[PDB]
Amino acid sequence: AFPELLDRVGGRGRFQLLQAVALVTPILWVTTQSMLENFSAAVPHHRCWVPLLDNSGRDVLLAVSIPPGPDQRPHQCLRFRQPQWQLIADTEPCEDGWVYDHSTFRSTIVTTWDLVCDSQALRPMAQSIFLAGILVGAAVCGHASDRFGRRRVLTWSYLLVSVSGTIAALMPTFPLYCLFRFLVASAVAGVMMNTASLLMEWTSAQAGPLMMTLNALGFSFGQVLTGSVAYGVRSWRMLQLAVSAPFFLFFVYSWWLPESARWLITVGRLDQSLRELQRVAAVNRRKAEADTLTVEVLRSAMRLRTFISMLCWFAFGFTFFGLALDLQALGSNIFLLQALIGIVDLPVKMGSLLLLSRLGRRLCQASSLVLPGLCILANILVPREMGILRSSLAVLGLGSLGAAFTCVTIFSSELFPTVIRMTAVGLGQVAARGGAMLGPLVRLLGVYGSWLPLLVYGVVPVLSGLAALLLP
Ligand SMILES: O=C1C(CCS(=O)c2ccccc2)C(=O)N(c2ccccc2)N1c1ccccc1
C-alpha cells in the first residue's frame, strides 16, 4: 500500500528533482574513474637505451645503433651489441632500460614501471582485474543493503572510493596499485547499485521512464568529462588524485539526503520513516495530506527468450569493454576520441529508438547489434590511406553499440510472464559484468597477427544479433 502513501505525500514535485540531480552528478566521476585506464596506462613510442646517444648526424647514429624494425620503425625491443659501422646477426635485449617519447604524455604507468617488451602481458591484465573487482563488489553489495540500510552504504562507498583512489596514486610497486584499483572498482560498483536503487524507490509509478534514462545520460556525458579532464592534466600521479578528490566532498554533502522510506517500513523503524516522510513533504511543500499519517496507517501497511537476453548482454559487454579501453588503435589524437562517444551516443540512440520502435520491437533489437559489429569489421578492410574514414567508423560503431543497453532494457525485458521487470534487468546485467572480465584478455592475442582481436570483437556481436532473430 506504499504507492498510496507516496501519492499522499507527493510525487514528481521539487524534492524528486533535487535528489535526482545530487544522485546523478556522482555518475560522471564514476565514469571518469572507469575509463581512466586509457590516458594513465598509455603506451608511448619506446626505444632501447644506447651509450652512443642520449649522452654517456643523429639519424646516422640511430641507424647504426638499433636494427630496423618491421613496421617502418626502429626496433623497440632489440639493440646491437656493438656499433655496426659497416652500415653507411648478433643482438641482445635491452638491459639499461628504455627511453620514451615525451611529447603527448609526461609520465604514464608504462613509463614508470616499464610494462613494455617482454612484460607486455601485464597491461591487459590490470583492466581485467578492475572489471573482476567491479563484478565482485556488485555481487557483495546486493546482500549488504538489507542489513545496513540504503543511504549509509552510499556514503560509506563514497568515502571508500575517495580514500582508495587517493592511496592508489602513491604506490611504488605494481601489485599494490592493482589491489587498490580492485578496491576502487568494488566501491564504484556499490555506488552504482545503491544510487540506482535509491533513484528507483523514492519515485512514483512513472519511475520506469526518466529516472532510469537520467542514469545513462550520466555515463554518455561523463565520457566527455573524462576526455576534458584528460586533456587538462597529463601526468598520471596528478590525474588519479585530481579524479578521486571530489568524492570526499561528495561523501561530505551526502550526509543530508533522506533515506528511502520503503526500506524502513519492512524492518520496523516506524519513527524514522515518519520523520523522513514529513521532511520530504515539507520540502515538496505538500504539507496538506501529511496529518493523516498517524503511525497506524503505516503499521497496517507493513526460457529461450531469457537465453537470448543473456547472450545479447554478454556480447554487448564483452565487445564494448574489450574495445573501448584501447582507443589508441582505432585512430589518433586520443583526446578527441573518448570525447566523441557521448556526443555521438545521444543523437544516435534517440533517433534510432524513435525510428525503429514503430517498425517493431524485435526488428529494433536485431538491428542494434548487426550494424555496429559490421561497422567495426569494416574498419579492418579500409587501409590507412584515409584516416578520417579509418576513425569515423569506430566512433559510429561504438555509438550504435551503446544503444543496446538502452533498447534491451526499457523496450525489451518484457519477454516473460510480465509480472515485474526488476527480476529480469539484473539477471540480464549479471552476464554483462561477467562478460567484460573476459574482455581485454582477448587483446593478449596481439602476437600471431594483430587483426585477430579486432576480428573477434567484430564477429561476436554480429553472431549474437543473427542468433537474436531465432526467437520462435
Ligand atoms: O549503466 C551501467 C550500470 C547499471 C547498473 S544499475 O543501474 C541496478 C539496477 C537495478 C538494481 C540494481 C542495480 C552498469 O553496471 N554497467 C556496466 C558495468 C560493467 C560492465 C558492463 C556494464 N553500465 C553500463 C552500460 C552501458 C555502457 C557502459 C556501462
Of ligand 1's listed atoms, the one at least distance from the Cα of 200 is: 10
Query: In angstroms, rounded to a whole number, what is the distance separating the alpha carbons of residues 407 and 349?
Result: 9
Distance (angstroms) between ligand 1 centre and the Cα of 282 equals 33
Distance (angstroms) between ligand 1 centre and the Cα of 357 equals 23
Distance (angstroms) between ligand 1 centre and the Cα of 261 equals 24
Q: Are the C-beta atoms of residues 47 and 98 closer than 8 Å to each other?
A: yes
Query: In angstroms, rounded to a whole number, what is the distance separating the alpha carbons of residues 55 and 25?
Result: 50
Query: In angstroms, rounded to a whole number, what is the distance separating the alpha carbons of residues 180 and 165?
Result: 7
Choice from 429, 430, 437 to test ligand 1 binding pocket (greatest atom count within 8 A of CB):
429
Q: Are the C-beta atoms of residues 38 and 334 closer than 8 Å to each other?
A: yes
Query: In angstroms, rounded to a whole number, what is the distance separating the alpha carbons of residues 210 and 312?
Result: 24
CATH domain 1-40+114-302 topology: Growth Hormone; Chain: A; (1.20.1250)
Distance (angstroms) between ligand 1 centre and the Cα of 386 equals 36
Q: Are strands 98-100 and 46-48 parallel, antiparallel or unpaired?
A: antiparallel
Q: Are the C-beta atoms of residues 436 and 317 closer than 8 Å to each other?
A: yes
**Could you tell me the CA-to-CA distances from 141 to 149, 163, 188 in Å, in that order?**
11, 18, 11
Of ligand 1's listed atoms, the one at least distance from the Cα of 142 is: 12
Residue nearest to atom 25 of ligand 1 (CA): 405
Query: In angstroms, rounded to a whole number, what is the distance separating the alpha carbons of residues 420 and 27?
Result: 26
Q: Of 160, 254, 220, 258, which is closest to residue 28 (Cα–Cα)?
A: 220
Choice from 405, 425, 438 to test ligand 1 binding pocket (greatest atom count within 8 A of CB):
405
Q: Of 190, 189, 167, which is closest to residue 177 (Cα–Cα)?
A: 167
Q: Are strands 91-92 and 79-80 parallel, antiparallel or unpaired?
A: antiparallel
Of ligand 1's listed atoms, the one at least distance from the Cα of 135 is: 19
- Nine-digit cell string for 356: 525503429
Query: In angstroms, rounded to a whole number, what is the distance separating the alpha carbons of residues 60 and 130?
Result: 44
- Nine-digit cell string for 464: 549474437
| Dihedral in degrees, nearest 10, Cα atoms 295, 297, 300, 301 | -100
Query: In angstroms, rounded to a whole number, what is the distance separating the alpha carbons of residues 207 and 425?
Result: 15
- Nine-digit cell string for 130: 578492475
- Interaxial angle between packed helices 15-34 and 211-232, expressed in degrees from 0 to 180 and rounded to the nearest 10: 40
Query: In angstroms, rounded to a whole number, what is the distance separating the alpha carbons of residues 322 and 326?
Result: 8
Residue nearest to atom 13 of ligand 1 (CA): 193
- Domain coordinates in residue numbering, the chain: 1-40+114-302, 45-100, 303-472
- PDB experimental method: cryo-EM
- Interaxial angle between packed helices 15-34 and 270-284, expressed in degrees from 0 to 180 and rounded to the nearest 10: 100
Q: Rounded to the nearest 5°, which phi and psi values hold at 48?
A: -100, 135
Query: In angstroms, rounded to a whole number, what is the distance separating the alpha carbons of residues 391 and 380?
Result: 11
- Nine-digit cell string for 444: 593478449
**Amino acid in the structure at residue 451:** W
Cα end-to-end span (Å), the chain: 39
Residue nearest to atom 12 of ligand 1 (CA): 193
**Could you tell me the CA-to-CA distances from 133 to 69, 293, 458 in Å, in that order?**
38, 44, 26
Compute the chain's Rg from CA coordinates: 26
Distance (angstroms) between ligand 1 centre and the Cα of 244 equals 20
Distance (angstroms) between ligand 1 centre and the Cα of 161 equals 17
Of ligand 1's listed atoms, the one at least distance from the Cα of 436 is: 20
The 3 state secondary structure assigned to 272-288 is HHHHHHHHHHHHHCCCC
Sign of the Cα torsion 358, 362, 363, 367 reads positive
Q: Are the C-beta atoms of residues 31 and 218 closer than 8 Å to each other?
A: yes
Give residue 176's region: left, alpha or beta (phi > 0; psi -120 to 50): alpha
Query: In angstroms, rounded to a whole number, what is the distance separating the alpha carbons of residues 63 and 432?
Result: 49
Distance (angstroms) between ligand 1 centre and the Cα of 138 equals 10
Tell me the sheet residues that pair with 44: none
Distance (angstroms) between ligand 1 centre and the Cα of 420 equals 19
* Specified resolution (Å): 3.5
Match domain 303-472 to its CATH number in 3.30.450.20, 1.20.1250.20, 3.10.129.10, 1.10.3210.10.
Answer: 1.20.1250.20
Distance (angstroms) between ligand 1 centre and the Cα of 213 equals 12
Query: In angstroms, rounded to a whole number, what is the distance separating the alpha carbons of residues 34 and 165?
Result: 12
Contacts for 239 with CB less than 8 Å, ≥ 6 apart: 36, 39, 40, 229, 230, 233
Note whether 1-40+114-302 and 303-472 share their fold. yes
Q: Which residues have CB under 6 Å of ligand 1?
A: 134, 192-193, 196-197, 215, 219, 317, 321, 405, 425-426, 432-433, 436
**Could you tell me the CA-to-CA distances from 418 to 200, 412, 422, 423, 424 in Å, in that order?**
19, 11, 11, 10, 10
Distance (angstroms) between ligand 1 centre and the Cα of 429 equals 7
Choice from 192, 406, 413 to test ligand 1 binding pocket (greatest atom count within 8 A of CB):
192
Distance (angstroms) between ligand 1 centre and the Cα of 73 equals 42
Sign of the Cα torsion 47, 53, 54, 57 reads negative
Contacts for 86 with CB less than 8 Å, ≥ 6 apart: none
Query: In angstroms, rounded to a whole number, what is the distance separating the alpha carbons of residues 119 and 112?
Result: 13
The 3 state secondary structure assigned to the chain is CHHHHHHHHCCCCCHHHHHHHHHHHHHHHHHHHHCCCCCCCCCCCEEECCCCCCCCCHHHHHHHHCCECCCCCECCCCEECCCCCCCCCCEECCCCCEEECCCCCCCCHHHHHCCCHHHHCCHHHHHHHHHHHHHHHHHHHHCCCCCCCCCHHHHHHHHHHHHHHHHHCCCCCHHHHHHHHHHHHHHHHHHHHHHHHHHHHHCCHHHCCCHHHHHHHHHHHHHHHHHHHHHHCCCCHHHHHHHHCHHHHHHHHCCCCCCCHHHHHHHCCHHHHHHHHHHHHHHHCCCCCHHHCCCHHHHHHCCHHHHHHHHHHHHHHHHHHHHCCCHHHCCCCCCCCCCCCCCCHHHHHHHHHHHHHCCCHHHHHHHHHHHHHHHHHHHHHCCCCCHHHHHHHHHHHHHHHCCHHHHHHHHCCCCCCCCCCHHHHHHHHHHHHCCCCCCHHHHHHCCCCCHHHHHHHHHHHHHHHHHHCCCC
**Could you tell me the CA-to-CA distances from 195 to 45, 218, 413 in Å, in that order?**
41, 12, 21
Residue nearest to atom 1 of ligand 1 (CA): 216
